[PDB]
Design an enzyme around this catalytic site. Structure first.
Site, short mmCIF file in Angstrom:
data_model
loop_
_atom_site.label_atom_id
_atom_site.label_comp_id
_atom_site.label_asym_id
_atom_site.label_seq_id
_atom_site.Cartn_x
_atom_site.Cartn_y
_atom_site.Cartn_z
CG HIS A 198 14.10 -3.05 -26.78
ND1 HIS A 198 14.63 -3.75 -25.72
CD2 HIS A 198 13.53 -1.94 -26.25
CE1 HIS A 198 14.40 -3.09 -24.59
NE2 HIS A 198 13.74 -1.99 -24.89
N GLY A 219 11.12 2.83 -19.84
CA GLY A 219 12.24 3.69 -20.16
C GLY A 219 13.54 3.37 -19.44
CB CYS A 276 15.80 -0.81 -21.65
SG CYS A 276 14.51 -2.01 -21.20
C1 LIG Z 1 13.04 -1.03 -21.17
N1 LIG Z 1 12.91 0.22 -21.20
C2 LIG Z 1 11.87 -1.88 -20.69
C3 LIG Z 1 11.98 -2.11 -19.17
C4 LIG Z 1 10.67 -2.81 -18.68
C5 LIG Z 1 9.57 -1.95 -18.72
C6 LIG Z 1 8.70 -2.38 -17.44
N2 LIG Z 1 9.73 -2.99 -16.47
C7 LIG Z 1 10.87 -3.24 -17.15
O1 LIG Z 1 11.86 -3.72 -16.69
N3 LIG Z 1 11.87 -3.16 -21.38
C8 LIG Z 1 10.66 -3.60 -22.11
O2 LIG Z 1 9.67 -2.95 -22.12
C9 LIG Z 1 10.74 -4.96 -22.79
C10 LIG Z 1 11.01 -4.98 -24.34
C11 LIG Z 1 9.71 -5.47 -25.03
C12 LIG Z 1 8.76 -5.71 -24.01
N4 LIG Z 1 9.57 -5.62 -22.65
C13 LIG Z 1 9.18 -6.16 -21.35
O3 LIG Z 1 9.92 -6.01 -20.44
C14 LIG Z 1 7.87 -6.91 -21.27
N5 LIG Z 1 8.23 -8.15 -20.65
C15 LIG Z 1 8.26 -9.32 -21.50
O4 LIG Z 1 7.97 -9.24 -22.66
C16 LIG Z 1 8.65 -10.64 -20.83
F1 LIG Z 1 7.63 -11.00 -20.01
F2 LIG Z 1 8.89 -11.59 -21.78
F3 LIG Z 1 9.80 -10.42 -20.12
C17 LIG Z 1 6.78 -6.16 -20.46
C18 LIG Z 1 5.50 -7.05 -20.44
C19 LIG Z 1 6.49 -4.82 -21.20
C20 LIG Z 1 7.21 -5.89 -19.00
C21 LIG Z 1 11.07 -6.12 -25.36
C22 LIG Z 1 11.71 -5.76 -26.72
C23 LIG Z 1 11.23 -7.50 -24.65
#
Ligand SMILES: *C(=N)[C@H](C[C@@H]1CCNC1=O)NC(=O)[C@@H]1[C@@H]2[C@H](CN1C(=O)[C@@H](NC(=O)C(F)(F)F)C(C)(C)C)C2(C)C
Ligand SMILES: *C(=N)[C@H](C[C@@H]1CCNC1=O)NC(=O)[C@@H]1[C@@H]2[C@H](CN1C(=O)[C@@H](NC(=O)C(F)(F)F)C(C)(C)C)C2(C)C
Lengths: 306, 306
Positions: free
Chosen positions: B41, B143, B145
Site C-alpha cells: 500500500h 508511518g 508499516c
Molecule cells: C502503516 N504505516 C499504517 C500503520 C497504522 C497506522 C496507525 N496504526 C497502525 O498500525 N497502516 C495503515 O494505515 C493501514 C493501511 C490503510 C489503512 N490502515 C489502517 O491501519 C487502518 N485500519 C484499518 O483499516 C482496519 F481497521 F481495517 F485495520 C486505520 C483505521 C488507519 C488504523 C491500509 C492500506 C489497510
C-alpha cells in the site's frame, strides 16, 4: 496506538561489546575508541570476591594478563588503569564502530535499556528503571557483568549503567561508566543493606497519560486536587512526593491530552484509596511506574534515532 | 536471576531498514541483498486505501517512481514485482550489511521481536506474540508499516512479520515476508471481523516455570491431574487446549525444575478456579501468556547470538 515496554534499538551498543578474560574469570567489556571498560572484579578469583583488595590484585597484573576478544580477533592490551570500580584497558586498536556517546549518571526514577551479554555476545535487550533505592530489577546470570545500560538521543548513546552484582532477592546493582556505584553498595560478596523501595509517582502519572492517549479512560474522575493534598495521600501508599519539577515535566502530556496534571493527580488519588476494582489499565492490573514522561512521548509520537 | 520481557538484539535488523516513498506515501522497507521488501500500500493515496486495486495501481508505476533511501543515499530501483501483499523492489546495490536470514511463517502462540521504525529509522524494540486469532498487540503509529518482526538463532535472522494495519481497538495485523496475511484480513481500510482471542496455555505454563526458577513458588500445590481433566477445566476459562506436543516442548523446563508438566497443570488449574488471592507472580497480578518455553530457556540460561 498500543503501548508496550519498549527498549532503544541496541545495534550501536552491540558494536561495542567485547569479552574480557583475566586468568580464569571472563566477563563483558565496552570498547569505545581505543579503551575497553569493564568491572574490576574480572581480576578476582572466586575466593577473592569474598573480601577483595582490588588495588593489591591489580598490582600483580600486567597488560598481557588481560585477554580481550572482539569476535574472534584478540585486541592487544597496551595499558591499564582502574577508576573507582571499573577497569580501563587501553588497546592498540580503536573500535571503528564507536558511536557518538557520552557517560551520564542518571537519577532515580529514570529508565534505560539494558543489553544483556555473555562472553561478549548479546543475548537480549530490555527496559529497566533506576529504583528510588538505587537498585534495578533486571535479568542477569553468571557472566553478565559488564553488560551496560543506555539511552539514545538521535545518534548519541548515553551510557548510564554497567552491571556488577545481584542481591539474592533478584535485585541488581551496578555503577555508572566512571565506576561509581549507584546506591550504598560495594563490589564485595557480602550481605548489604538496601533502602526500602518506593513507587515513582511521576512515572505512574506518565503511564496514566499513556492510557488516556490509547483510549483507556475509565479511571478519570471529575475532581481536582492541590499538590500538597495529593502528596499527603501518596505518602501513605509509599509513593515518592511529586514536585513542581515533575509537574513541569508532565506538561507535554498534559497539553496533548487536555488533562491538567493536578486533575490526573486527583484520579490517581482515587485509584490509590479505592483500588482498581478488578479492572485493568493498558492491560495491567497494577499501576506501572517504569515509564518516564519521555518514554511515553517517544513511544506515542514515534521518535527515531540515527 | 530476574525475569523481564526481553527482545532479541536488534542490530542485524537495523542494518536492513530503509525508507520507501512512492509519490507522497512513505513507509519502511527491508533491504536484503539487492531486494527491498515493503507493504504494497506504499503505492496508494489515502483515497486509494478505502478500496484499492493494487494490480491496477502498480501497472501505472515504473521503477523510477520508487524513491528508496538508505540513510542519505538513494538506492536506484531497477525492477519491481508484487508478491501477495508485499512489493519487492530490485535495487542496483546489494546491502553489505545483509545478515544470514530466512523467511518463516510462525504459528499462533509463538513470539518475536518487533523493530518499530519510521522513515526508515529505528524507534524501539519490543516483544510480541502472534495471538491465537492471528492479531498481535503491538505499538505502531502512522508511518510504521514495513516494520518487521523477527527471531534470531545464533547468527541467522528469521523474519516472520511485516506490519500493515491497525484495527481501531489497538489490535495489529500484518503478513509474513511472502506477503501473506496472518489471519483472515486484507489490506483495505474497511471494518473486518477477527476471531475471539484465547489464552496461550503452553506459554502460561512456561512462565510459571520461570516463576519457580526465580523463587516465586507459592502457587505450587500438592496435586497432579490428567491432561484430559486439565483441558476440560481450561476450556471454560478460554484457554487453548494443551497438546502432547506442548507437554513435550515443556520437557526441558520440567526437567530443570523437577516439576512434572501435569503437576504444574494442577497448579494452574487451581489458579484458574480460585484466582491469585491478591498475590503476584513474577511481579504480575495476571497470568502472563506471551513467553514461550524457548523464551524462558533463552532468558534463564543466557543464550547469546553471533
Ligand atoms: C502503516 N504505516 C499504517 C500503520 C497504522 C497506522 C496507525 N496504526 C497502525 O498500525 N497502516 C495503515 O494505515 C493501514 C493501511 C490503510 C489503512 N490502515 C489502517 O491501519 C487502518 N485500519 C484499518 O483499516 C482496519 F481497521 F481495517 F485495520 C486505520 C483505521 C488507519 C488504523 C491500509 C492500506 C489497510
Ligand atoms: C557478574 N558477572 C555477576 C552477575 C551476577 C551473577 C548472578 N546474577 C548477577 O547479577 N556478578 C557477581 O557474581 C558478583 C561479584 C561477586 C559476587 N557477585 C554477586 O552478584 C553476588 N551477590 C552479592 O554478593 C550481593 F548479595 F552482595 F549483591 C551473588 C551472591 C554471586 C549473586 C562480586 C565481586 C560482588
Amino acid at each position: 496506538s498500543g503501548f508496550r515496554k519498549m527498549a532503544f534499538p541496541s545495534g550501536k551498543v552491540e558494536g561495542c561489546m567485547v569479552q574480557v578474560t583475566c586468568g580464569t574469570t571472563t566477563l563483558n567489556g565496552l570498547w569505545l575508541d581505543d579503551v575497553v571498560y569493564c568491572p574490576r572484579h574480572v581480576i578476582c578469583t572466586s575466593e577473592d570476591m569474598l573480601n577483595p583488595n582490588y588495588e593489591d590484585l591489580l598490582i600483580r597484573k600486567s597488560n598481557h594478563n588481560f585477554l580481550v576478544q572482539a569476535g574472534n580477533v584478540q585486541l592487544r592490551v597496551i595499558g591499564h588503569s582502574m577508576q573507582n570500580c571499573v577497569l580501563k584497558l587501553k588497546v592498540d586498536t580503536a573500535n571503528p564502530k564507536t558511536p557518538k556517546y557520552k557517560f551520564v549518571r542518571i537519577q532515580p526514577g529514570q529508565t534505560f535499556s539494558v543489553l544483556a551479554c555473555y562472553n561478549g555476545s548479546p543475548s537480549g535487550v530490555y527496559q529497566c528503571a533506576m529504583r528510588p533505592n538505587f537498585t534495578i530489577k533486571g535479568s542477569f546470570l553468571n557472566g553478565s557483568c559488564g553488560s551496560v545500560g543506555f539511552n539514545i538521543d538521535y545518534d548519541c548513546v548515553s551510557f548510564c549503567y554497567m552491571h556488577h552484582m545481584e542481591f539474592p532477592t533478584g535485585v541488581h546493582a551496578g555503577t555508572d561508566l566512571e565506576g561509581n556505584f549507584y546506591g550504598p553498595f560495594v563490589d564485595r560478596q557480602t550481605a548489604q543493606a538496601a533502602g526500602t523501595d518506593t513507587t515513582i509517582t511521576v512515572n505512574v502519572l506518565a503511564w496514566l497519560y499513556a492510557a488516556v492517549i490509547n483510549g483507556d479512560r475509565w479511571f478519570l474522575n471529575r475532581f481536582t486536587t492541590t499538590l500538597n493534598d495529593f502528596n499527603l495521600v501518596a505518602m501513605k501508599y509509599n509513593y515518592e512526593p511529586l514536585t513542581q519539577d515533575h509537574v513541569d515535566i508532565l506538561g507535554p502530556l498534559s497539553a496533548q491530552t487536555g488533562i491538567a496534571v493536578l486533575d490526573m493527580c486527583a484520579s490517581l488519588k482515587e485509584l490509590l484509596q479505592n483500588g482498581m476494582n478488578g479492572r485493568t489499565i493498558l492491560g495491567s492490573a497494577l499501576l506501572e511506574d517504569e515509564f518516564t514522561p519521555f518514554d511515553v512521548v517517544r513511544q506515542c509520537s514515534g521518535v527515531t534515532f540515527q
